[PDB]
């Protein structure tokens, strides 16, 4: 797992700078109108054995919501998770199954991708879900079931949770995450599944706003875990312990 | 299942209730050396594939020094008051099989999953397996048994534990209405709990010493040799699907 260095973190940091201006947190001329299928992607992995991991994309109709598409791979990880290169551990597993799911089912590529984690809201506004998304040219949301902590940029943990219990008690259900010292929304703590008090935090992934991101995930749910990713991490994680 | 086999369960447990010994004898906490656990994952997918876990932890550190797993094929479906035939013949598989590799860490009790004595005709699983296999065992129950020709009533009885609870207390006896016994006891013994789970004499041992053994073995909710039994045959189950 020798693969973190002080070298290399400082040429992850230099990919995420050349990087971050190529991210779109804009619609285009795409809409959810056109939705028709959403994908999603995760990534299981062993404690036992540190190589052996699984990953799974799957494709869901919208907004029914029905599994069309399914596969998980047997692959080695390059790098362990470390927050803010998330991007790095991820990108060639995803890659391969995106090109598997264009050879097998080309007409079920979906318009966009639910992807673990943060897009937009990251230190240098270039997470996992951005990242994928335009390295592979693909329209991505971020969906982080727990909060960053950015220091840098005024985002706190407590402060965050607190503002939003006190939203809650006026009825709201989404909560902007702004960044200070850029004076930006960086994500969007939303909670639309019911029964549920514990929010997520939706992020423009790549050829998307954070407002249609936003309603997409809502589309995508039924309980806190919006379906497409609930089905990846769940299938990844099924394959993982069969072959452990 | 069918009326015959009912009326044939039904017959052996009449058989059986009166060998069970609800008794220490010589037995005592001060003898515990090794306590067993035991259990049995199926599958929902196939109905006849399972396996089967039995577990041996050093008394009272709670450290695991035996563990074996076996692909089985279920004899019968589970119905309540008749959980021993679904599982009396794994067992037996599971404790020749430890006698036969580690005799000396053959354990003084073995914990078992659901009731012993707290039972329609006072023979639970516990109580049966503990019996056909001569060995000392005891029931604990994650969730409560309704009897009502015993006079137990789940809301009666959760009710109760929520007064004791609210006083302090930590144990509630469980009794027949109709005969006028103890059947069992309510504890909560793991800290930030407030779920009971039950435990009833199984064989060979009073239900005092019973509960005594029970909280000896705890850490959580779940005692230690059923956690660990019930971890074993699951993850066991997940690589055969
Ligand atoms: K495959
Ligand atoms: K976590
Ligand atoms: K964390």
Same mark, same amino acid.
């Given at each position: ?46 404690? @036992?054995?540190?190589?052996? *991991?699984? =990953?799974?994309?799957? !494709? $869901? %109709? ?5 599994? &069309? ?53 990251? @230190?240098?506004?270039?997470? *996992?879900? =951005?990242?994928?998304? !335009? $390295? %592979? ?5 971020? &969906? ?65 706003? $954070? ?34």
């Amino acid at each position: 797992d020798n693969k973190i260095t002080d070298e290399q973190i400082a040429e992850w940091n230099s990919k995420q700078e050349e990087l971050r201006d190529k991210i779109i947190r804009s619609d285009g001329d795409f809409s959810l109108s056109k939705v028709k299928y959403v994908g999603g992607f995760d990534v299981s992995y062993s404690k @036992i054995n540190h190589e052996l *991991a699984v =990953s799974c994309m799957v !494709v $869901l %109709s919208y907004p029914e919501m029905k599994q &069309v598409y399914m596969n998980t791979t047997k692959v080695k990880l390059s790098c362990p998770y470390k927050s803010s290169y998330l991007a790095f551990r991820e990108i060639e597993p995803f890659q391969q199954e995106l090109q598997l799911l264009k050879a097998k089912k080309p007409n079920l590529e979906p318009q966009v991708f639910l992807l673990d984690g943060n897009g937009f809201f990251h @230190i240098r506004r270039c997470g *996992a879900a =951005s990242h994928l998304g !335009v $390295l %592979s040219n693909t329209r991505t949301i971020g &969906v982080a079931k727990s909060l960053i902590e950015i220091p840098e940029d005024g985002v706190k943990k407590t402060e965050v949770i607190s503002q939003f219990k006190r939203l809650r008690k006026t009825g709201g259900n989404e909560l902007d995450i702004i960044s200070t010292e850029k004076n930006e929304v960086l994500a969007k703590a939303v909670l639309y599944a019911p029964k549920v008090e514990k929010p997520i935090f939706v992020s423009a992934g790549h050829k998307c706003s $954070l407002e249609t991101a936003a309603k997409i995930v809502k589309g995508c749910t039924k309980t806190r875990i919006p379906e497409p990713i609930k089905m990846a991490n769940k299938w990844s994680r099924k394959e993982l312990k069969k072959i452990e």
